[PDB]
Ligand binder design. Structure first.
Ligand SMILES: Cc1ccccc1C(=O)CC(=O)C(=O)O
Ligand SMILES: [Mg+2]
Ligand SMILES: [Mg+2]
Ligand SMILES: [Mg+2]
Length: 709
């Protein structure tokens, strides 16, 4: 075989070599000790990992049976969940004690970017998205409407560009207002006695709050740029009258640069497809290159930014997004390592070991600098159900730290609140990680998937779009904020909210996503560097720190509200509405899955039934498949409806896609990808907690097997 024996484990050769030859050198960790620790940790923790998974199944069985035996008593339901151990006692008030955390996390409110780690180009751009051009983000998106005269063309449109300039001028007025007048009338900027002076047509003025002046570049009397700060976030006005845009500007302003993606989550979970050692190694290698600073795709990582202080001295700001890594959760095994019985090893355990080992490089000098200067490794742990599962993650990290010779608590945990049993036990979950937690985040897409599967037997659910605004989800959002603030997260840890999936609807995002920081979230998720820059605007308009202060002590969600099942009312839909829902889900499912199975792409932009481009990953797939499963289970639709829609949408997806692409139609059953999509719906009710990995992984491996022979 092509495996390496270490104790009871048989490690795929490609993974063994990668760890030894690429990851271990420079960590000062004895290799034999590392591998012994791998075997030991896997041996010691696997039983509890299995027990926790079995507990999920047992609880779901009882809940399924509860709905089945009744013909909607919140009182009785709540007592039942208590009896079975689903709803646990709430612990007394406490405050988290997490330490050694960077300011980007404890203090700074701003955008958080998530990107698939298996795509080096995207990962690189994402790390570099700490700073982004506001002009490019406005000009290149629909935030400036493409009305007549302002449409995008092959070359620069001054009507459009002038609207960009004015938009940003208004942003400056709103964010760092002048003592008198408006940035729109500025004719120049200078630094005099350490104070920013803005020349206006018939006078000059300073800032209403001179403390917002953070620095400059070039000569004080004719700067190349001016640096401002507001709500802890930097804004840089680039000055160059000799530039394409600058020459058209009254003050020669070239661009406005926003500090944007303050942190970035490098994702090994829902936005990547990795089903064997080869895929995991591609991912691990990228994570390694990021932490060593030498990833090159040839584009590379940016250096820090140099500035002159108001007084005349020097300082630097970080050029890169502070990096988290999202490990997989407790569910899946992977055959990258198997034991002597041929049993696959739990992937979550493997990720802790390997991504933790690799992260050590980010704690030390890059030959090309330092991810975490405070000495922490930031791991987002997804898809946990309840406080015991959180405690298990903490014990896993404790054991890994021992293997890696790291101080206890080095490996921090970003807790996704994205499963119902975590939501309804959130305080206890936070308490279980009280010395490790660096965020809680409402992963609302997974949470919706879990909502549907948990009450699968209850009755038919409301349509997917409707889910987005159901009582249960709004309560879940407020409850998360309440719990975090009560645990003392303000100034200590991030309170985060979810992803904006409509990658091209930036005007809509700028209009609507402002609700997130208004709700007291100190970060929320964006799909791209461009969206990070635009979402940053919201943090300039809302003072999140103040909002969190104002929410202190408030309790705005009850357990009854959290437990309100999103069942549909009688006669809710006309036939065309049902057909729309089916087609919409089938389109999104097929569009995502075909690239997953045939190309190993874990995140794709897929137009919905309204031609809206949506960023799809396993969470959104979890919702679509579970919703159709639910409708099939309750007779809203038939298996022929599902068949018809999948077959209808298949050619449109073939059309949307080429090169490595293999069309699904007309020979649907020759397409493993098409059969995968079908399986996800038809077997959806039987998947543990409605998770999509078991099917996707089986089918992707099947496809590789055929393409290989
Ligand atoms: C990264 C991403 C990109 C696009 C869509 C979703 C996602 C998520 O992975 C979201 C998430 O965890 C949650 O809501 O469950
Ligand atoms: Mg059953
Ligand atoms: Mg999720
Ligand atoms: Mg303010």
């Amino acid at each position: 075989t092509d495996r390496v024996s270490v104790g009871n484990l048989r490690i795929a050769r490609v993974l063994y070599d990668f760890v030894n030859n690429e990851a271990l050198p420079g960590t000062d960790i004895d290799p034999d000790s590392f591998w012994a620790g791998v075997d030991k940790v896997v041996a010691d923790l696997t039983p509890q990992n299995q027990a926790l998974l079995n507990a999920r199944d047992e609880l779901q069985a009882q809940i399924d049976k509860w709905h089945r035996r009744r013909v909607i008593d919140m009182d009785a339901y709540r007592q039942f969940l208590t009896e079975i151990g689903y709803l646990l006692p709430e612990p007394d008030d406490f405050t988290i004690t997490t330490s050694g955390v960077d300011a980007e996390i404890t203090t700074t409110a701003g955008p958080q970017l998530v990107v698939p780690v298996l795509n080096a180009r995207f990962a690189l751009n994402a790390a570099n998205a700490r700073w982004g051009s506001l002009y490019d983000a406005l000009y290149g998106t629909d935030v400036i409407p493409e009305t007549d005269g302002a449409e995008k063309g092959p070359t620069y449109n001054k009507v459009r560009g002038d609207k960009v300039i004015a938009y940003a001028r208004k942003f400056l007025d709103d964010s760092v207002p002048l003592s008198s007048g408006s940035f729109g009338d500025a004719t120049g900027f200078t630094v005099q006695d350490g104070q920013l002076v803005v020349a206006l047509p018939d006078k000059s003025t300073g800032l209403a709050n001179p403390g917002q002046f953070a620095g400059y570049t070039g000569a004080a009397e004719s700067p190349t740029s001016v640096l401002l700060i507001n709500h802890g976030l930097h804004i840089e006005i680039l000055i160059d009258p000799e530039s394409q845009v600058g020459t058209t500007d009254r003050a020669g302003v070239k661009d406005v640069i926003l500090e944007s993606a303050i942190t970035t989550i490098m994702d090994f979970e829902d936005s990547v497809a990795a089903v064997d050692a080869a895929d995991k190694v591609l991912g691990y290698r990228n994570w390694l290159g990021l932490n060593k600073g030498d990833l090159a795709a040839l584009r590379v990582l940016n250096r820090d930014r140099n500035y002159t202080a108001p007084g005349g001295g020097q300082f630097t700001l970080p050029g890169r997004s502070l990096m988290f890594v999202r490990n997989v959760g407790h569910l899946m095994t992977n055959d990258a390592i198997v034991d002597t019985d041929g049993s696959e090893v739990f992937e979550g355990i493997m990720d802790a070991l390997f991504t933790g080992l690799i992260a050590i490089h980010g704690l030390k000098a890059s030959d090309v600098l330092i991810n975490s200067r405070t000495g922490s490794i930031y791991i987002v742990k997804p898809k946990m159900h309840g406080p015991a599962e959180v405690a298990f993650t903490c014990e896993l990290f404790s054991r890994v730290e021992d293997v890696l010779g790291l101080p206890q608590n080095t490996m921090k945990i970003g807790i996704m609140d994205e499963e119902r049993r975590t939501t309804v036990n959130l305080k206890a979950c936070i308490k279980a990680a009280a010395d490790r937690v660096v965020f809680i985040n409402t992963g609302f897409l997974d949470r919706t998937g879990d909502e549907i599967h948990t009450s699968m037997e209850a009755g038919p659910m409301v349509r997917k779009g409707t889910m987005k605004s159901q009582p249960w989800i709004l309560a879940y959002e407020d409850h998360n904020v309440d719990a975090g603030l009560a645990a003392g997260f303000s100034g200590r840890a991030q309170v985060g909210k979810g992803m904006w999936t409509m990658t091209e609807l930036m005007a809509d995002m700028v209009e609507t996503k402002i609700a997130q920081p208004r709700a007291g979230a100190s970060t929320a998720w964006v799909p791209s560097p461009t969206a990070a820059t635009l979402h940053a605007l919201h943090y300039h308009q809302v003072d999140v720190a103040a909002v969190q202060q104002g929410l202190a002590g408030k309790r705005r969600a009850t357990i009854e509200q959290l437990l309100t099942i999103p069942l549909a009312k009688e006669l809710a839909w006309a036939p065309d509405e049902i057909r729309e829902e089916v087609d919409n889900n089938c389109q999104s499912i097929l569009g995502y899955v075909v690239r997953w199975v045939d190309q190993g792409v874990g995140a794709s932009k897929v137009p919905d039934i309204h031609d809206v481009a949506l960023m799809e990953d396993r969470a959104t797939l979890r919702i679509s498949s579970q919703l159709l499963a639910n409708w099939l289970r309750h007779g809203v639709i038939t298996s022929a409806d599902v068949r018809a829609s999948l077959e209808r949408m298949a050619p449109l997806v073939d059309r949307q896609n080429d090169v490595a692409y293999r069309p699904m139609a007309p020979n649907f059953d020759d397409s493993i990808a098409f059969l995968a999509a079908q399986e996800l719906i038809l077997s959806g009710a039987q998947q543990p907690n409605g998770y999509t990995e078991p099917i996707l992984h089986r089918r992707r491996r099947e496809f590789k097997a055929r393409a290989a022979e």
